[PDB]
Amino acid sequence: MRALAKLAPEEGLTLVDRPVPEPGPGEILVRVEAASICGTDLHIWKWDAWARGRIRPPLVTGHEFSGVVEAVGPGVRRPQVGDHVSLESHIVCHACPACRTGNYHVCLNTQILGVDRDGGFAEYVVVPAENAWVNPKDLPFEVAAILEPFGNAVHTVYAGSGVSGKSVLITGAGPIGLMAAMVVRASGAGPILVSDPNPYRLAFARPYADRLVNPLEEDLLEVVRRVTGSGVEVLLEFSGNEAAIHQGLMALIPGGEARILGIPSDPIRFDLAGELVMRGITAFGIAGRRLWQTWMQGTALVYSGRVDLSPLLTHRLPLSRYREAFGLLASGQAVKVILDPKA
Amino acid sequence: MRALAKLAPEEGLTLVDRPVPEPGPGEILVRVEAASICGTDLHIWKWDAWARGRIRPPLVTGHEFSGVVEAVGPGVRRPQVGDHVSLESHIVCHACPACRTGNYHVCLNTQILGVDRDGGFAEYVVVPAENAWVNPKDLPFEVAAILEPFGNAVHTVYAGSGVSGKSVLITGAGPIGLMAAMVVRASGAGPILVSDPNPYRLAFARPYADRLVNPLEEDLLEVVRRVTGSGVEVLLEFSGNEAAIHQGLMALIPGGEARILGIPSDPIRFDLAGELVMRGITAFGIAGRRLWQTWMQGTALVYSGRVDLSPLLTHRLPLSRYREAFGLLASGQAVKVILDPKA
Amino acid sequence: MRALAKLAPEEGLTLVDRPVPEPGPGEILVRVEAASICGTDLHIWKWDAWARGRIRPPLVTGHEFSGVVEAVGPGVRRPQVGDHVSLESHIVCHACPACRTGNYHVCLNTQILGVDRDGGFAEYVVVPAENAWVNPKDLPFEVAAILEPFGNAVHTVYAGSGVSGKSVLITGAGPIGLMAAMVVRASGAGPILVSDPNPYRLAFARPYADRLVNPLEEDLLEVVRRVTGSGVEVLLEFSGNEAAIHQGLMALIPGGEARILGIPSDPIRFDLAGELVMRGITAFGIAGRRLWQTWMQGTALVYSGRVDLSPLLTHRLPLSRYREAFGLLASGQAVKVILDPKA
Amino acid sequence: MRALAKLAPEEGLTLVDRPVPEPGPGEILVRVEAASICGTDLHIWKWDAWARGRIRPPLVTGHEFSGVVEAVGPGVRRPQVGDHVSLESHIVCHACPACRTGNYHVCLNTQILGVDRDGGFAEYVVVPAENAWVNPKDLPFEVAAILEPFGNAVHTVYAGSGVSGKSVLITGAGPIGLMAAMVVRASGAGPILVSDPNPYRLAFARPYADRLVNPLEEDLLEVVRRVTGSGVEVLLEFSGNEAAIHQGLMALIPGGEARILGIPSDPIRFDLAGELVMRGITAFGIAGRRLWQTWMQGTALVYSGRVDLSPLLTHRLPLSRYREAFGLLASGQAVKVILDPKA
Numbered sequence A, B, C, D: 001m002r003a004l005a006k007l008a009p010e011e012g013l014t015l016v017d018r019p020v021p022e023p024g025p026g027e028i029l030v031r032v033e034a035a036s037i038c039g040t041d042l043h044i045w046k047w048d049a050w051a052r053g054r055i056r057p058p059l060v061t062g063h064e065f066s067g068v069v070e071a072v073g074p075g076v077r078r079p080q081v082g083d084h085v086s087l088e089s090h091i092v093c094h095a096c097p098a099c100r101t102g103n104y105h106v107c108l109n110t111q112i113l114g115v116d117r118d119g120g121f122a123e124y125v126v127v128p129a130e131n132a133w134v135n136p137k138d139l140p141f142e143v144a145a146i147l148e149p150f151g152n153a154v155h156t157v158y159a160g161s162g163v164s165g166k167s168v169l170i171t172g173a174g175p176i177g178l179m180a181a182m183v184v185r186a187s188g189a190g191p192i193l194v195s196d197p198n199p200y201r202l203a204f205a206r207p208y209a210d211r212l213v214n215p216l217e218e219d220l221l222e223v224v225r226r227v228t229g230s231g232v233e234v235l236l237e238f239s240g241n242e243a244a245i246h247q248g249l250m251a252l253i254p255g256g257e258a259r260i261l262g263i264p265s266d267p268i269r270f271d272l273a274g275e276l277v278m279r280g281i282t283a284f285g286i287a288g289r290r291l292w293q294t295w296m297q298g299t300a301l302v303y304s305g306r307v308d309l310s311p312l313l314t315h316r317l318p319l320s321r322y323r324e325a326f327g328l329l330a331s332g333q334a335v336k337v338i339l340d341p342k343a
């Protein structure tokens, strides 16, 4: 079995060759058909702070993957051999406050596939049976591979009051913010504004946004004010950029909602009273995918065709050419990159 | 000025010549550009049980309309002369338990234009200033004229948990149901099924619904089982047909939501324990339009093009030819019929 | 081991003597310390329609019970030997629409302890480990035994908009409606009205209600109107009595919520339009306990002392004297009856 | 008439003799029976940064008061002469995006009695008719006078998911925090912890909180760990102290809610990713009182006795002795100080 792994406390990844793992009680063996990469894999790649204080080599990485169920552990009745399944990366403890409360997306003992244990950057991987989401056989594995990150967008968009019949400002047109714009557009939001200084990705939202904006070339606040008449009702933050955050909040009309998925790199300067309290803003910190509700909403949009994730898949490279795949990541020249573990 | 009114407790309406109403404090004078007809108007027209117990001749009917603010009463700050407006038919008291709660759509003292007082089937109509929703000057009056019934659809769809990423079944492809079909399609529901025995009407849903069903030709329940694998998460009831209701409630999965706008003509046989309680269903009684929240969502969808009502405007006729107009609606071989009070 | 079981398709129960069951994978063995009875056990007792079309003798009954964890199945890490636990009677499939959706209280393949499989009317019983709710050692088993039905009240009360700062009308002062009145009173509802023609139980709510009402001796509608000024905001239905249902709905102000737990014996005559739709009422069909959310809210009220369930425990009889316990049930002369399986 | 006003941009206030204001269209004349003082009034009194940028002398201050409707302007249907009323300090415009949404508490054009125009620190005050909340004639004016700040507590507590059956931590035992403590206790929260270094104040919470904590004496976080076994489900922030905020946000369990009313004096250092996003926390910015929804809930609790504010009224003094009154509040050795404008 071909697999991509982090073998030591250092930069880069190593294409190794492991024995096909066997599933046990409550587990299944997935024969990966497609996998994708995101900023998290990049952190590991670069072997930065985050990675250093979290990754325990040796580890086969990859948390965005899809495939077929090859065999199941003893006593596993679901899913079944032959099922096409996408994977939920978070493995929840089912024994902490968050889990009783039903907030599995924030289980205090979360274990992320490809971050804490072997992931999908391999021809085969073993995962908990409860983490497999069965997909119709006709859903392409390449789209199926990005359902996990798509779920991050879905969760952010549908959190709080949703976006149907509401004015939306999405700050950040990265892969996720991009899926968000696809979702909000299909959810009936309007007007829909998407802001991102990078024109490459910003152009990707043109067919979904009502107004594209380069905060560097144009004054976002003024554009929003010209498009809505005042502010937006919902703010979907996917940039993690302090300047964008403060800007987004100002664009919000009093009493509106700010749904934040973006992870800033450093603590921000925040005027609680001015940006949140006095304006009656509600800030929703979005993490992971609401376990199952997010997957239902998301896959429903995808299965029925309300959204088409195909245009976000810019490159598909054999797993063996991972080096280039990660270079595209750092580059930013691609949206989502699919890795074929079979080559 | 030309006007259409019920001049005595009996069938039909009479084209009459009334003087132009005068707007006083807190009122405005609206020059009607377009008006539409609905089931209610048919009730009044036929003079059935419903009408007999609610209408008090002499009454100028018409509650679905739009026009220009030709004049405003002393002290009326908004809207303004020249403004293009759609009208909220319900006039609330601001002095009842419902109003104090914000549930203006169920004001204990609700008064309805074209029902309790003179409506829009005339060249001019005086309404409360606060009932005029100013539209963009470029919105076609015909569409503006049907924002009221559109709101009934909007209210129903966005009530409760909404429909984004949810399987939806719509019983009733009448005008309001079709509008609901447009809205849910534009809101990201899926799969989307619409049921109605009138083929002429069921057809207008073809571009919005994922599955059309003639309950007389097919077993709606079994069709839903195939389309969703079990039931729908949301049932939007717009028929008022007892059989449809029980059927619709059966197509609901346990824990689902039933949003009901439909007005059944007679009490129904209801197995409370079997159709609601034991299945954890929640039934939402939908009445009117949430004041402003519904208009915001609905006009947002319309203004931005998320939805396009134009295909619902099947007929146009001068007010002088109302007889023909009501006959059409009566036949059910029409969706939204527009009356022009100027001719 | 002493156990009470239904051994044949007939009335009554038989005190038998079985071998102590052994827990297996994912199971635990509970040494019951206290058990209680409700209308469901009564149905079985009487061997009526419900029971006949649901009970498969031989069966050890009882679903309201508490006790200590004696031993656990192999591989069970929670709960632990020594833990005091109350039991959730519903065993969910974790493989049906309702479960993905998180509505376990309505799992389509629910299996009720003491209704579909051996229950707690025995010194020992084996149940799924996930169904045990650990309680502090100092919570009396007698109170712990009724947490299950208390959860039915909690679920009804906190469904929808809750009751804090709201006027409440509870129709039905049976054991459950009684716990409800205790809950709403502790949740800050007010004014609080409790209606029940049976003065025995109606008096039990005196220390919790603001107004007790005998619908037979007094006109409920008038009392509500005198206490609130119009109607109540919330209706908690626990009687299943058609007359009470129609009455309760009328007492509701337009736009209010009706939370229904009560199971009517026959289909009711329901005027959808008049009692629900036109008044903008939302009817919440409450079933079971929201899996875990209900238990959290409920046990929180109980552990912190916000509510004291002690006064609802009117009788405690040895299990061997079940005959009398069931007679009290039918009698209605008691609230909750505790059965001591150790005698 | 006697009045207390800021007559120039500097410290202190001046007892002056102003003529009796006259109520015009849509207004009423209120004869003040009692008024209270709050932090805002202290700001104005000290003439600090906050005041300097908001106050425009000459200003009669006082926004927390109650009295009798002595007169009404032409056409004022409600309230009526003789009515006992409490006043909503915020005067909304009914013509901004916040108002159209119903979020009147954050009206873009909010005007505040005793801040932007003459308030209640006088024998008479003219206010908008719609700002008068009629109370039962038997409610003590002193209590009626503090329903405004009480509403800030109510709004905070019932925002989001409320507090029933939930563990709650309250940071800030200032007047509003104590009121929140009363409310949560009466709403069924538990365990309930309140934190504040001022022992004089922390003490008033003793009868409502389950655990009192002096963050200077004990480690609040570790105390919460012992009381709940982990964290609280809800954090009600009423201090505005940065340290308290971070601490409070840490005591929150993942997926919890932080409702913030507290106004920090300076921007804070906020690790958005660590304190909000990654932990799935939702921060609710609380401003003012939801118009009518908050007053309903709050007066409901008060009218029915679910809560009793009397113990919060620590001092009473004629308006002529405001100096003494402000000094007390300034020392923090007082909770709600009542000023009597008649003396």
Ligand SMILES: NC(=O)c1ccc[n+]([C@@H]2O[C@H](COP(=O)([O-])OP(=O)(O)OC[C@H]3O[C@@H](n4cnc5c(N)ncnc54)[C@H](O)[C@@H]3O)[C@@H](O)[C@H]2O)c1
Pocket (backbone or CB within 6 Å): A038, A039, A152, A171, A172, A173, A174, A175, A176, A177, A178, A195, A196, A197, A198, A201, A215, A238, A239, A240, A241, A243, A244, A260, A261, A262, A263, A264, A286, A287, A288, D277, D278
């Ligand atoms: N909360 C969670 O569980 C979770 C999960 C996965 C990813 N994330 C985070 O969510 C964010 C979005 O993910 P992504 O893959 O799209 O990231 P990305 O870094 O690829 O995209 C961020 C985008 O922000 C844009 N941006 C920068 N400054 C901006 C500004 N001032 N205004 C508007 N846009 C601006 C950039 O052009 C960039 O395309 C990242 O910060 C990521 O780390 C969070």
Ligand SMILES: NC(=O)c1ccc[n+]([C@@H]2O[C@H](COP(=O)([O-])OP(=O)(O)OC[C@H]3O[C@@H](n4cnc5c(N)ncnc54)[C@H](O)[C@@H]3O)[C@@H](O)[C@H]2O)c1
Pocket (backbone or CB within 6 Å): B038, B039, B152, B171, B172, B173, B174, B175, B176, B177, B195, B196, B197, B198, B201, B215, B238, B239, B240, B241, B243, B244, B260, B261, B262, B263, B264, B286, B287, B288, C277, C278
């Ligand atoms: N609650 C409110 O405030 C409010 C406001 C306006 C209208 N309404 C009511 O809402 C409903 C919708 O309005 P509309 O103008 O679209 O009504 P409509 O009468 O034009 O349409 C009702 C449709 O139900 C269809 N139908 C009949 N039996 C059916 C069945 N067995 N299964 C599926 N469909 C079936 C009919 O063919 C018809 O097209 C009406 O009942 C109306 O009275 C309520």
Ligand SMILES: NC(=O)c1ccc[n+]([C@@H]2O[C@H](COP(=O)([O-])OP(=O)(O)OC[C@H]3O[C@@H](n4cnc5c(N)ncnc54)[C@H](O)[C@@H]3O)[C@@H](O)[C@H]2O)c1
Pocket (backbone or CB within 6 Å): B277, B278, C038, C039, C152, C171, C172, C173, C174, C175, C176, C177, C178, C195, C196, C197, C198, C201, C215, C238, C239, C240, C241, C243, C244, C260, C261, C262, C263, C264, C286, C287, C288
């Ligand atoms: N939905 C569920 O999952 C679920 C679970 C358990 C029990 N239940 C049902 O909930 C209901 C309440 O349970 P319970 O144990 O308190 O039942 P119960 O039968 O002991 O009490 C019902 C009460 O209704 C009262 N009542 C009858 N007519 C009335 C009227 N006209 N007005 C006011 N009160 C009236 C009676 O005096 C009686 O005390 C029952 O119908 C029970 O079968 C439902």
Ligand SMILES: NC(=O)c1ccc[n+]([C@@H]2O[C@H](COP(=O)([O-])OP(=O)(O)OC[C@H]3O[C@@H](n4cnc5c(N)ncnc54)[C@H](O)[C@@H]3O)[C@@H](O)[C@H]2O)c1
Pocket (backbone or CB within 6 Å): A277, A278, D038, D039, D152, D171, D172, D173, D174, D175, D176, D177, D195, D196, D197, D198, D201, D215, D238, D239, D240, D241, D243, D244, D260, D261, D262, D263, D264, D286, D287, D288
């Ligand atoms: N958002 C709004 O519309 C609105 C309206 C009114 C008041 N407020 C604000 O709400 C807050 C509460 O009002 P108040 O009158 O009760 O305020 P207050 O100033 O009387 O009380 C604040 C309390 O915080 C306590 N405190 C200080 N450090 C603490 C710490 N480290 N941990 C715990 N407690 C600590 C203080 O001892 C003090 O008693 C204030 O900040 C006020 O400015 C906001």
Ligand SMILES: [Zn+2]
Pocket (backbone or CB within 6 Å): A037, A038, A039, A040, A063, A064, A149
């Ligand atoms: Zn990823």
Ligand SMILES: [Zn+2]
Pocket (backbone or CB within 6 Å): A092, A093, A094, A095, A096, A097, A098, A099, A107, A108, A109, A110
């Ligand atoms: Zn967990």
Ligand SMILES: [Zn+2]
Pocket (backbone or CB within 6 Å): B037, B038, B039, B040, B063, B064, B149
């Ligand atoms: Zn109509």
Ligand SMILES: [Zn+2]
Pocket (backbone or CB within 6 Å): B092, B093, B094, B095, B096, B097, B098, B099, B107, B108, B109, B110
């Ligand atoms: Zn009203």
Ligand SMILES: [Zn+2]
Pocket (backbone or CB within 6 Å): C037, C038, C039, C040, C063, C064, C149
């Ligand atoms: Zn029971």
Ligand SMILES: [Zn+2]
Pocket (backbone or CB within 6 Å): C092, C093, C094, C095, C096, C097, C098, C099, C107, C108, C109, C110
């Ligand atoms: Zn299930």
Ligand SMILES: [Zn+2]
Pocket (backbone or CB within 6 Å): D037, D038, D039, D040, D063, D064, D149
């Ligand atoms: Zn104040």
Ligand SMILES: [Zn+2]
Pocket (backbone or CB within 6 Å): D092, D093, D094, D095, D096, D097, D098, D099, D107, D108, D109, D110
């Ligand atoms: Zn405003």
